[model samples]
Structures are given as C-alpha cells and as structure tokens.
Target: NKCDVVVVGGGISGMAAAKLLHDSGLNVVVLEARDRVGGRTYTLRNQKVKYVDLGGSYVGPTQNRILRLAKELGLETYKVNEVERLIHHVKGKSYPFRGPFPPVWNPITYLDHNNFWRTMDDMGREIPSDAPWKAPLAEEWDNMTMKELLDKLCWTESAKQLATLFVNLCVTAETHEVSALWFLWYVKQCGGTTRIFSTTNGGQERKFVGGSGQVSERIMDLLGDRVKLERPVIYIDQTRENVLVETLNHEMYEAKYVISAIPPTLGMKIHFNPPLPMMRNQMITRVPLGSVIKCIVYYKEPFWRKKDYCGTMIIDGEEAPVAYTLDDTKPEGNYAAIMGFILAHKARKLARLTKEERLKKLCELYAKVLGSLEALEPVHYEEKNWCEEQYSGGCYTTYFPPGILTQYGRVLRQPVDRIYFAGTETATHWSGYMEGAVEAGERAAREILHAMGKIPEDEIWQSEPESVDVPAQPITTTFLERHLPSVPGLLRLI
Candidate 1:
C-alpha cells in the first residue's frame, strides 16, 4: 500500500493527526494493531448499563484542547459530579471527610497554602507559563526524586502524606521513582496546583456524553478509507528516499515520513530495518509503564449518593486491591457505575484468583466505605486489565528507580531517521495523560507538516543538546528526614 502519509497507531493522538491531515486534502492511512480504536480511552457497553469509561475517564476545564475539538465536532458532553465527601481507608480503617474542592490558590490542605502556592508561583516565574515543560532550570531540582524534594522542604507529616498521595495518584507510581522536576513542572504548567483542580460550579469535570469512544468514532469518520484495522506493523526501515513499514501479516506500506504515535513500551518491540541507535534501544528497554487495572462494578442503583456518599475510596497500603474508586453515575439514573483503579504491582498478586474471588475482595473493601456492598447491589462487574492486554502492555508510563527519567526519558523522546515518535508517554505538557497524548500528537503532526512544507520550522528544534546531561541527583538522608518524617515505616526504611 502507498499514501501521502501513513500513521501508525489508532489512539487519540494518531486519530487526531490523521483527521487533520486528511481534512487538509492529504491522503493518509492509519494502521492500528488492535481491532478497535481509542487506544487508552475506551468505553464499555454491557450488562444493561449505558457505558463505563474503562480508560481515560475525566477531563477538567483547564484541559480545553479536547473540549474545544468536541465542540467543533458537534460532540455532546456532560458534567461529571465528583463533589462528595471522600473516604480514605488506611491500615483497614475508613475515615469520612468532606471539604470544598481544594482552593484555586490553595491545593494542599496540609501545607500553608500561602507558602506552598508561593513556591509554585516562583517556579513558574523561571519557565514560560505557556510552555513550562521546556523550562531550562537544570539547577532547579530536576535531578531530584519527588521524595527527596519533599524532604528538602521539611513538609509536615500531613503535608508530606498529602503530597505523596497527590503524586501517587497523578503518576500512579511510588514517590521514590518520580522526578521532583517533573512534579514541579506539572505544578507550574497549570499555573498552580489549585488551578489544576478548580472547575466551574456544577461543571466539575466532563466527558463525552456517551464516552471517550466518540472521539475515536469522530476521527475514524474523518479518516474514512484511510484506516486499516488489525494490521500491526512488525518492522520498519528508513532510507534516504522513503520509509518502509511492514506489518506482521507481511503487508508493506511506504511513505516519505513515518510517525509512530503508539505507546513507547509497545513501539520498541518492532524491528527497525537498520536497527535503532544503541542508546535508543536502551531507552526503549529502560523506560517502564505503570501496571494498572480498572475494575468497574455496576449497581442496581446509585446507593452511595443516596447515603450522602460520593462513592470515592483511597486505601494506603502495599497490598491494596484498588487505589481509589470513583462514582460514575449519570444524572436521573438508577443504573449506576463505580470504577476502581488497581495498579499492576498490587493487581498481579491477585492474578491467581478467579474473577469471582477478585470481585468478592472488592466487595469487602467497598463495604468498609459504603456501609454495605449489599446496599449498592452490584448487578455485574467488568475489569480492564492493561497488564493482560496484548496491544497496550500497560495503562501508561510511570517512573522507575535511579536515573530512568533524567537519563532515559531524554532519549526516549528523541526522533530519529525520518521517524518521529509520540504518545502520552512522550508528551511534555501532561505526560502519561490524554492531554499529554493530544499535546504530543500535535507536536508530531507539526514536525511532519514542517517536513512537508505545511508549516514553518520551529526554532526549538535548533536548540537540541549535543549530549543530554543526565545528572544523578541522589536522594540524601537529610532530605528524606526533612520532608518525609511522617512517611510510613515501610517507605521510610527504603
């Protein structure tokens, strides 16, 4: 097969780029390894419920890019009501608490909002408000892990726990692995942590009225004849003249440029014709994906809401089944859904159990928070195990021990030999998120567009480092003692 452009991957990023390229009158072909669309943004329709967001579920107002496209495409959206007293269960005790959503200027309840947000404001001062990720503040804590930086600040016990929980929820990884630099950049990117949480009154967060699958449907509608499902590219070769892409079925497609917008962990498996650079190969092998599983339970009624509960739960432990639970009930509905997120490391241990056993365990956990699982009356259950999925391999990217982010992340995003890479993992704005996926897709599209003479070259391209200085900023004991004095005994020992 041949075309003006060939897009590999059918996720939101690839679909968006292909749609834009095709709408601009360019012939494009999208090859998705999976039989379906919406890479990580999936909606499941089963068991009499309308749908459940098994993948990327919520979007805030600050994330206007997706919403803007949804409006332009005439897609319907509805508010996600997440305003209920949340329960935090730690060491087997569930505590109930409620507050006005975190303040716009004050995100962390444990820290003096003034001091914490002020520090965030100062960090933003050094970076572009519009492009905080590209900030060149190598001196400003980029080398440190999130745990180390928290210790340096001598945050109170509650403050440290709050920060750790926030990072844990955001990256879905332990604090020791995540970069302090990335966290600060994340805080700065949204102006402040408070800005990150605020939504219009009654506008909490929104999703496509039906599901995120609508975005994928819209893209496929635009791509039309250009999309090729079930064609997983197994090998790619780049030469001076054209790029050769071959699928596992021995089908070949050639193009002037090849853009890979797939997950990096999965993208690395494909054989490169001339073989990728050794450093690139190492980067592919080293970068890790956070193990994740989304277990959703459908109930006969929205009982938690009637009991004045928001249907939220957070458990702090190593062997916990689900990190948190969210109420997915729509307005005017007796059929309600509660989705529980289970990280891989924890979920894998339960792999030996039958689906019934897993569901029983979840019921016990939820009973602690909701008073009784019998009240919610779960009708059926659905679990999307990313670790078990052949195509995705994992839900999204997460940090690893040592210098993975500082060293490997730099090279992992580097483009090579007429091949540009993207996906949520490679994104700068909201890395490991749907927002990041969109940002990266736009970036990759711009790169291809520039090569095709559709747009001017970006000056940022000229500022490439000859050799990225992957510094080793080890966490000091003093740093740990200062910020994380309140950390659990297990983490403190590490």
Candidate 2:
C-alpha cells in the first residue's frame, strides 16, 4: 500500500491526524494494532442500560480543544453527578466529610496537606506546558523525585501518604517514580493542581453522552476503510525519499510522510532503520506508562444516594487495592454505576490475581467503604486492565522518570526524517489526557501541512486560548504558605 501519509496507530491521535490529512486532499492510511480505535479511551457498555468509560473519561472547563472536536462530532456531554459528600477510608475506618478536604486528623496533618498543594501549585507556575526543561530551576527540580520534595517540605507520615495517593491517582505512578519537574509541568499543563484534582469546574467535570471512544469511532467512520485494523507496524525505513513501513504480517506501506502516534514506550519497540537520534532513543526508553485497572460496578439503582453519600471515596493506605471511586451512574439509565481505579504498585500486584478474585476484592472494598452489604452483590461488574492489553501496555499515559525529562525531553516531539510523532505523550498541555491526544494529533497534522507546503510557515496553528500562564517570579515555600488561605474550597480527591 502507498499513500501520502501513513499513520501508524489508530488511536485518537493517529485518527485525528489522518482525518486532517485526508480532508486536506492527501491520501492517508491509518494502521492500528488493535481491532478498534480510541487508543487509551475505551468504553464498555452493559447491555442497553449503561455505558462505562474504561479509559480517559473526563474533560474540564478549559479543555476547549477536545470540547470543540466533540461538538463537531455531534457528541453531547453531561456533568458528573455532584458529589455531596466524600468518604476517606483510613486504616479500617471510613470517615465521611462534607467537602473535598479529607478529615484532617491533626493540626500538623492539616498544615502539611495545605502546604503540599500550595507548593505544587506555586511550582507549577514556573514550568511552561510546551517546554518544561527550559525552566530556570528545571535541572534542580528534575534531579529530585516527588518523594524527595515531600521529604524536603517536612511532610508528616500521614500527609505523605495522602500526597502519595493523590500523585498515584493523577499520573498512575508512584511518587518516587516520576520527576518533580515533570510533575510540576503536568500541573501547569492541566492549568494547575486544582484543575487536575477537582471534580467541579475541573478535569473530572464532564463525560460524553455515550463514551469518549465515540470521538475516535466517528473519526474512523469518516475515514472508512482507509484505517486497517490488526495491522501493527513492526519496522520503518526512513532512509530513502519515501518512508517504508512494514506490518507484523509482512504487509508493506510506503508514504511521503509518516505519523508515529503510538505511546512512546511502544513506539520504541519498532525497529527504526538507521536508528533514531540518541536523544529520542533515550527518551523513549526512559518513558514508561503508568499502571491502572479501571473497574466499574453496576447496581439496580443509586442506592448510595439514599444515604446521602455521593459515592465518592478515597482510600488512604499503602496496602489498599482500590485508591479511588466515583459515582458513574447515568442520569436516565436503568443502572447505577460507580467507577473505581486500582492504581500504581497496587495495580501491578493485583494484576496477577484471577478475574473472580479481583472482582470479589473490589466488591468487598466497596461494601466496606459504603457500609452497605448490597455493594457486595452488584448486578454487573467489569474491569479493564490496560497493562494486560497486548497493544496498550498501560493506562492514563506515560511519564518521565527523574532526570529523563531534562536530559532527553527536547526530542520527544521532534520529527525524524519524514516521520512525525503524535500521541498524548507528545502534547504540551493535558499530556496524559484525551484532550492532549487530540491536541497532539492536530499539531502533527499541521506540522505535516506546513512541511508539505500546503500551509505557510507564518500561518500559526492555535488549538485554544492558553488557560494557564507561566509565572515570572520564582516560588518559595514561605510564599506558598502565606497564600494557602486563598486557595479554593476542598476539591474531590479523585
């Protein structure tokens, strides 16, 4: 097969790029390893009653890039059910709180929690979404891990546990696994820690009417048979004028330009002819996806609502299997659902368990937190372990470890020969979210258009107005502590 462009990966990023190229009169083909589209965004439907998003479920107020695309695709979105109460599970007890703040057991714990978020938000201002490595303190910050930051801030054991859980929830990685600089950069990308962590007026605000996967499905539908399923690109030779791509089944494809839209870790698996730049190679090798198993439990009705419980719970324990849960019940559906995320090291450990065992464990946890025996007998239960998926190695998105972001991060989005990179990982803003995937795809498409002379170099491509701006002055612990009182109301710790 031959075309002007070959998109290797039929995820949202690949399909979005391919759609643009096709609409611009360029012959394009999308090669997807999986039998379906949407990449990390997968929707699981239960009969005709409810649709559950197994991946990349929510979008926030300022994520206009994805919202515009959803509107164009004729997809309607609804707000997540208002969480009236929060349940914090610590040790063997469940503490019910009215607002986002988990019940602070002590004055020191309260101070630590407030200081931690304030420091994160302050540091987030220093980094820019596009180029975090360019920040003044990038080297120093990248040299440390999130664990080191907590230690330096003098966080109590209890505070550290809560902070660690929040980090795991956000990036699906342990606190020590990711760089401090990269963490701040992620916060900046999502506007701030508040936006990324909040349910109201934040990233977890809205959900698609059917599912997020519909966006990719609609795009693929428009492309028709141009997208080839079960076609995994095994090798790519970009030495010649036209790039040659070969699939696992020995199918060959030639294209003037190619978009490598798979996850960075998966992208590194393919054999690149003549090898990639040393920086790019090192970046991909160091970037690994975060572990997460998205599980959904369905009931005959919204039983928790009757007890005035919002169905949101945050588990605070190192040995806990489930970290978070939220009300996922649809407004007009016959079923009431609650989604839970088993993340980080726990997810890896639990991945070895049998399906029945995992289901039983999840149900037991739900029953314990909700204090209801009925939770143990949900009408339906389903879980998607992205780590076990053949094509998708993990869920949420990939992250850079300590020192990797500063050392080789510049080459992450840089093109090599006729090949351009497009994926959620390549996005400057909302890097690990569905919005970032679409932004990256569109950015790659525009880059190809400019390279092909279809668009002028001076013609700038803008996805949406920048929501967060980089700070001009440096942030300090004292400054953060002083401004902690002004921080918004307690947010849901999803």
Candidate 3:
C-alpha cells in the first residue's frame, strides 16, 4: 500500500519500468491486468516445436536495448534463415526474388516502387521520432491517410496496390486507417523502410534463443513479490500528494508516482479520479490497435529449404488469407516451421472459421506458392488472434488515424502531474517494438526519479544508436532487373 511507484499493466513495458525503479532502490509494485506477464510477447511450447512465439517475436540489429537486456538476462538469439530466394506470390503466381523486395515485371512500376521506398525513407528523416507532429509537414502529412499519400506517389495501379499491401503487412492495418505522418514517423523510428521490412539484419532478423517471453519471466524472478499478476488496477486517483491505485479486487495501494505501461486504449479503462486532460483523453481514444492472427505450421523437415527457397512469402492480394510469411524454424532445434500472418479485413472475415479451418486456408496458400502439395499437411499447427482480447485489443501495436497525430500527438509521452506514461507507443525509437517498450518504461521511471530530485533532467531521456543498412542487393538496371522479368520489362504501364 505504501510504495514509491505503482506501475500498471505488467506487459514488457510495465515490467521494464518496475525493474528499473526496483533496481534504483524504490519500492515499486507492478499490477498486471492479465494472469501472466510478457504481455504481447507470448510463447507456446510443445513437442513438435520446442518454443514458438505466437505474439511479438523476432529481434534484429539496432534494437540495442532489448538485445542488451536479453544478454544481461542470459537469453541469446539466432538469425532467421535467409540463404536462398524469397517468394513473392501475386495473381496466384509465385515469383522468386532476392533481398527484402521482389522483382517487378513492369519497369515503370519498378521505378515507381523504388521511388516510393526512397521517397518515404527521405521523408521519414524530416520527422523527428519523438515528436512527429512537430515536423514541418506534420499538418499536411497527418491530414491525409497512408492511402492518400500512396495515391500521390505511385504511378500505376499495381504500384499503389503493392505499397498498400506493404503498409498492411507492416502494421496489420489498412492504408486509409493510419496517418501518413504517423506511418512515416514510425518507419523513421525503426531507421527506414528497409529496416522495417527486411529479414536479414532487420526487425525480423533473429529470435530469442529460448523464447521471447523469457525476458519478462526472468525479470519477474528478479523482482519476486514486487510484480503481482492478475491485479488489474481499476481506478487511479492522483488528486492528492500520493497517488491512490485501486485494483479490480477492491484492493488499494498508495504511491508517489504511477506509470501506465499499457496501451492508450487499455489505459482508458482505468477510472482517473480528476479525469484525464482533454488532449490525453482524445488522443487515447484515437490511437487504435491493429489486429492479426499469427499461425505457424510445423513440418517433418525443411522441405522448402531443400528447394533453394527462403520461407519469406509476400502475398499480393487484398482478399488473400495471408499477408506475410516467414521461415520460423529454430536452427538449434532444427525444427521446420513456417509462420504466416492473416491481417486487416482478412483476419476479421476469416474469424468466422475455427483454428482448424484457419490453418487449412493458410496451408492451401502455402502449397500453391511453394508448388508442393506436401504443404497441405502439417505435423502441427497453432494460431493466436489478438483481436477482442481483454487487456489488449489487438497485436503488433497501435497507430494514429488521420488527423489524430498532429492534433493530439504531443500529449502521448508528456506526463500529467503524478501520472507518467510508459509503453511501446511512448517510445521515440522503435515505437511499436519490444525495444521501444523497454526504452519507454525506463524513460518513465527516469521521469519519476527526476521529479523526485533523485536524478537530473537530462537523465530522463536517452537516444539509441543510428541504424545502419544491411548488405542486400538492390533492383533496377541490374542483372536481375534485366533478365529476371519475363514480362514487358520496359513497359511504361502494366
């Protein structure tokens, strides 16, 4: 009941906040809404596959904080396989390509696609990761949706379609759903589009050796009684000197500071005594979380690998059951598995079917793409749909719709009185990732420490190392660009 800090929502972000505060010799208590910790980083273990991450998985270069913490906690990582060609399935035809991008049949669309990525990468640099709304074109960029921006940049219909699908695959949301400024800012936060979409040396480059959830669980072992599960805080009263926190079970605790480490949408469920400020209340209501179902199919061996194909499949259909696919096999275990994500409208429409039917559709798509009927049968299959979850409405992370970021973005990381915010969404770098969650949590704790005069103001904020591009071949005017395309290579339009 008497602590220096009370952290809400025991996800990776909240746990990180509690860990830092506890290490700083502060009496910090973490109230988790769910029965377990790890939040979005949930891992499932079974005989077929030793451990499979059904939630936030994969670590790559430049995500330094999570990598450092994982090392400190005795968790190592292995790179995802990327030795062969990638499959890009479009119009029911599978085309083999290299690097993170695919081969374009139309040269005009090729130029457009290349221009699209380069322009976005350059535009992203203009926006500050911490305050995208403060960017020069924030108003213009935020006023339009991602689709609107794409329409202006893309030359052909296929060009627009590919970019649209790229956005959907990135965040599990429609192009019209998110502000262009927000999307560009997020890409910049992760370094660039290449960093976000690439497999080797990208955000999806590697995975935790044991499991992704080990980070939080190991922290729990260190914190012990300080972290409590199933203690969902129902109300927060910060009117007086000490903040009052009431849990769902009617238990009360008083603390000098409160760190809300949950998503903005989930944070709204808690009753704030004095009511949240207008900007905070409005912004929380607008940044909605996107949803997707991640299904991993296990096999007897790496059959696709033997065929000289990397397990990265990019589906080019809006109505398709899967958006993106990955080679999910752990080399240490030598287990063969391919992970696929059903996103956007597809996830919602296919929610009608059972998990049994879910894997069937995904397997059929895989079979067609891989040109192997063996994909129709899997040794094991599993799925997790974050939509409609109690604590988190969806998976990946939240994003700002049109007009939301510029109007209300400033209040996101700004602390109000005794209440500070700590979540992946609050992070300046890697905003929608586990690395961001750790940084945000530590930043929030630092804010409280500075407010308490225990640390200096400059100590409250820290930046990450700038991201460097990986060694990957580019397209256009190259050998692959010239000889790879069987279609009209120099055609102005498709």
Best by lDDT: 3
TM-score for candidate 2, residues paired by index? 0.92
Residue-pair clashes per candidate, as listed?
2, 0, 0
lDDT of 1 by residue, 218-336 (tens): 88887776788898989988854778889987789988877788877676769987888887887777656666677877777777776777777666666568777777776656567
Better of 1 and 3 by lDDT: 3
Tens digits of per-residue lDDT, candidate 2, 237-290, equal 988878999999779999999998999889766999979888887777788888
lDDT of all predictions? 0.66, 0.83, 0.85
Off by over 4 Å in 1: 90-95, 100-143, 150-157, 190-192, 195-204, 318-320, 373-376, 398-401, 458-494
- Give the alpha carbon lDDT tens digit for every residue of 1-494 in model 3: 89999999787898888988999999999998788899998988887778899999987888888887777788878878898889988888989989778867666677677677777887998999878988999999999999999988887777787898889988889999999999999898998888888888588888888788998889989999988888988999988888999999878999999999999888788888899889987778888899798899988777898788888888888657987899888875377889999897787889999988888888888999999888987999988988968898897999889999988888988888899999999998888899999999999999999999999998998765532322323322445433443223344345
Model 2 pairs in collision: none
Which stretches of candidate 3 lie above 4 Å from their native place? 463-494
Q: Residue 372, candidate 1: how far off, in angstroms?
A: 3.7
How far does residue 480 in candidate 1 sit from its true spot (Å)? 26
